[PDB]
Amino acid sequence: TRFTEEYQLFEELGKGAFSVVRRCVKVLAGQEYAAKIINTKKLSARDHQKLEREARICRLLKHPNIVRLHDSISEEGHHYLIFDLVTGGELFEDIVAREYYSEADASHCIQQILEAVLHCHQMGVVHRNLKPENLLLASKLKGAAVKLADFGLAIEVEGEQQAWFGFAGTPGYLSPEVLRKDPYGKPVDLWACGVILYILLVGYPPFWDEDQHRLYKQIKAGAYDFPSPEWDTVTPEAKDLINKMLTINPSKRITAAEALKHPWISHR
Amino acid sequence: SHGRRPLIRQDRIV
């Protein structure tokens, strides 16, 4: 089949429970990509349909700040998802290396993430799993694009119609509405953007407990603050944008298109 | 820890 004929495989870039990502070259085109490789015989039909779902949602999306899926090739024993190669690693890794970002750098970062998220929302896709582990730097060069990845938990929504679709996401990034079994939709991604923006500016999250019982109570209550001294020199407008994203009521919470016009993003 | 938390990787989904 077409992958073995058209591509050469090189070094491992990343690994999951059920996948390996290797650099590949589309030999006749002289173009590099990242191949996410799944051993199909080791997976259930349920795991297969989750993969088909991910590929289907990725193909809806064409944006400079979203990892593009170029091809999907099912060979005997292995399935290949051919994505953009990105070489700058996870935003999570960048934040640990730098400790935290300047307001200028954090504004530039969250602007690109909001552009990606708005594009998803306009295409009726809710990601549900926004986190720095899931945002990739296109390269290691300064100013390299941040790109949304891992649509394995994403859902398709019908206009603005909401429901409790189910319990999905990453504990520290979960929205109050998801934890309360309230109807949800696009706003869950803006809550995660808030958690991300908080982390960018000081290098730790607004909600953390070893004890998940306490973590979920803390998220549902909107129980975060801005401790001294690190937050004392942070502009009020940066705090205001975080507060508008970490609004417990998902109706009142800032939208992606609204956040893109907030003066902390717009005035640059 | 006085408001400062660790940044800990969260790979595991619910």
List, in sequence order, every residue forming a beta bridge with A148; answer none if it has no partner. Answer: A66, A135
Pair of tokens at residue A154 = 């994403």
Q: How far is A214 from chain B (nearest CA, A)?
A: 14
d(CA A116, CA A67): 10
Please confirm whether the linkage preceding A229 is cis (ω < 30° from 0).
yes
Give residue for tokens 């206009």.
Answer: A159
d(CA A59, CA A114): 19
| Chain B residue at shortest CA distance from A200 | B7
What technique solved it? Answer: X-ray
Closest approach of A205 to chain B, Cα-based (Å): 7
Q: How far apart are CA A73 and CA A56, in angstroms?
A: 13
Q: At what angle do helices A91-98 and A187-202 cross, to 10 degrees?
A: 30
Tokens standing for residue A75 = 């060979």
Contact A235, A228 (CB under 8 A): no
Sort A204 into a burial class: Cβ within 10 Å, 0-12 / 13-18 / 19+.
Answer: buried
Task: Tell me if chain B has a CB within 8 Å of the CB of A133.
Answer: yes
With beta carbons less than 8 A apart as the criterion, state whether A38 and A82 touch.
no
Residue B2 DSSP class: T
Burial category of A245 from C-beta neighbours within 10 Å (exposed 0-12, middle 13-18, buried 19 and up): buried
Of A63, A185, A37, A79, nearest to A115 by C-alpha is A63
CA separation for the pair A217, A49 (Å, rounded): 34
Per residue in A73-112, is it b (16+ CB within 10 Å) or e — as a string?
Answer: bbeeebbbbbbbbbebebbbebbeeeebbebebbbbbbbb
Q: Name the residue among A95, A172, A227 with its Cβ closest to that of B10.
A: A172
Q: Is A185 exposed, middle or buried (0-12, 13-18, 19+ CB in 10 A)?
A: buried
- Tell me which chain B residues have a C-beta less than 8 angstroms from the C-beta of A91: none
Resolution number, Å: 1.9
Tokens found for residue A161: 């119609």
Q: Name the closest residue on chain B to residue A99, using Cα atoms.
A: B7
Q: How far is A171 from chain B (nearest CA, A)?
A: 7
Q: How many CA atoms lie within 13 A of A249 on its CB side?
A: 2
Backbone angles phi, psi at A42, to 5 degrees: -90, 0
Rounded to whole angstroms, the Cα distance separating A9 from A35 reads 8
Residue with tokens 């809710």: A126
At which residue do the structure tokens 């085109």 appear?
Answer: A29
DSSP result, chain A: -HHHHHEEEEEEEEE-SS-EEEEEEETTTTEEEEEEEEEGGGS-HHHHHHHHHHHHHHHH---TTBPPEEEEEE-SSEEEEEE----S-BHHHHHHHHSS--HHHHHHHHHHHHHHHHHHHHTTEE-S---GGGEEES-SSTTPPEEE---TT-EE--TT--B---S-S-GGG--HHHHHT--BSTHHHHHHHHHHHHHHHHSS-SS--SSHHHHHHHHHHT-----TTTTTTS-HHHHHHHHHHT-SSTTTSPPHHHHHTSHHHH--
- Give dist(CA A22, CA A20) in Å, integer: 6
- HSE at residue A76, side-chain half, CA atoms within 13 A, is 1
Residue type, A219: I
Sheet holding A69-74, edge to edge: A7-15, A20-26, A31-39, A78-83, A69-74
Q: How far apart are CA A162 and CA A167, in angstroms?
A: 14
Q: Identify the H or E element spanning B9.
A: none
- From the CB of residue A34, how many other CB atoms can be counted at a distance below 10 Å? 22
Q: Residue B7 has what DSSP assignment?
A: -
φ and ψ at A148, to 5 degrees? Answer: -70, 140
